Amino acid sequence: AAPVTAANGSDSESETSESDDDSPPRPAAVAVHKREEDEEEDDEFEEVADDPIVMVAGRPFSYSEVSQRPELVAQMTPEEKEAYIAMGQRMFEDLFE
């Protein structure tokens, strides 16, 4: 009845997103640690990085503190092992990737 058919919208469509990540699991154990002493044997300033708390045998410890010791890797409950892999999406995502 009225030749209008203008509708709405001008340039807002595309396909939203749903293509930001979704990658198969590849990494596992971290190997980065930076430094913890006092730079080149200096003073005042010190390098401090990041290291989340992982559950090992019910005792709270750092994530990188356990990965450096092979004796504390195979001695843990299987329920905490699924969380050990999920925690790997921090240093593998901040660095490299």
Partner: protein, 299 residues
Amino acid sequence: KCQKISPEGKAKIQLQLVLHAGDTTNFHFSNESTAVKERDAVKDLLQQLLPKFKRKANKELEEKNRMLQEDPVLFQLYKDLVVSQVISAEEFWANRLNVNATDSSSTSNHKQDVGISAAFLADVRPQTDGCNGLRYNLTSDIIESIFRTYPAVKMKYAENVPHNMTEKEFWTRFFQSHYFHRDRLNTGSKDLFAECAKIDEKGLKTMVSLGVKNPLLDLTALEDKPLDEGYGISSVPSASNSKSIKENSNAAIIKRFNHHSAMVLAAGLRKQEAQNEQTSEPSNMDGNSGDADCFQPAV
């Protein structure tokens, strides 16, 4: 980025938070209650506890059935009238549900913001800082703004991922210096420089096709007429050529000028294709201090 503390030998205890633009702010602790046990707690609780975010991965739809699926409360009414074979499906989408499906239809394809010159330019500054340190993406599509500013990324992501490489090694190549925006990349600076040259060439042809007032075109012929260039040669007399300063402070500003000025023009050509011709009204030439408001409608 990174934080710094004080050792056991230093008597002072200061906290330094290194940002990303080179701004370092010191924080000298002065907690008289517990400081030896808390100067490390601030260090420990900032490295043992880090926030995260969620990325939704679900197939979306475009039909009107999406409005009922997203709301479990509203979906119960559709099962009591259409599924219960008491009425017809056309009667429900006429007067019972008409004031809600109209407003919900606009937020089904709304990509953050439609504007780019004012409604989105005030929020594009914290989004164009693609660095590392500790920053992380959000739930919403935060990488869509790069597609609107860097058209070459859209083609390189669909023609090479997951073709040659995957998402595990691709985004960090283009984001090697997003704050710098003109770094060198072995992944393809050849495709990035060719895409930026095409946008600058397409945007230049639009201004030449219009041409309403270009005083700079006659400035070149005005100086070249008397066969004298005693003023055009001495353009930037910084007096620092071997020190790498004249071609350093000036290059870091002009290069960023072509990235910000052409960003608004490139987003405008993908909306109306330069068909408005900039209003083009004869009232622009008229500059009289009078008016012509004499016709009064409905009087």
